[PDB]
Amino acid sequence: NAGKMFIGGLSWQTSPDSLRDYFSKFGEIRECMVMRDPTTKRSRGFGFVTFADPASVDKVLGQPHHELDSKTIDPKVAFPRR
Amino acid sequence: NAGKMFIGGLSWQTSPDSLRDYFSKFGEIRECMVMRDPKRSRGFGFVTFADPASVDKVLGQPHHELDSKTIDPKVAFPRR
Structure with missing residues (x-):
């Protein structure tokens, strides 16, 4: 669903x-x-985030670079299938 | 938690x-x-077994294959 990222x-x-x-x-x-x-x-490793505002996803994807704990991390829209 | 793999x-x-x-x-x-x-x-797959013992049976089989691809199941330690 909305707001989720992998x-x-x-x-x-x-x-x-x-x-x-x-x-x-x-x-x-x-x-x-x-x-x-x-x-x-x-x-x-791998991370999962569920934003409160689904517009937060857009803010994340508009950055060119993401860095955390000195590593380049790779946020993607989550596409789960149960 | 327990019984999980990816x-x-x-x-x-x-x-x-x-x-x-x-x-x-x-x-x-x-x-x-x-x-x-x-x-x-x-992509990525996530399985939760009813009984942790099932994880041992997956890991005691050394080669796994699914839909033409060799796969490598691993224990999953999700932390919220």
Whole structure:
């Protein structure tokens, strides 16, 4: 549904509060989660954000660069299928 | 939480129902979900097993394949 985004490339050290704190700069956030890639303890992880205002997604995508915990992260519109 | 796994590299071919059918052979599944990237090659799948034991059966099988693609199921530790 609306307002949801899937984010790739998170540092292995990025916490959910680091993910929430960065993305709060484009709007209020309903739900936020980080999932580690366990192939290594030093592997890039994945993030999920659910914005309160679905216009927040637009604000995110209008940036050319996104950086978090010194890694370039890759926010995408989420396309879930249960 | 427990009993969760994720799979990368899913083709557009693979339906959520196909993913569920694949992993149900290792045990009953509570949740199953696919996240596509539309850009023409590989999305992500998420499965929640009823019983954590089912994760051990997936990981004790060394080679996995789904809809022509080798897949590499991994334990998922989501943290909100």
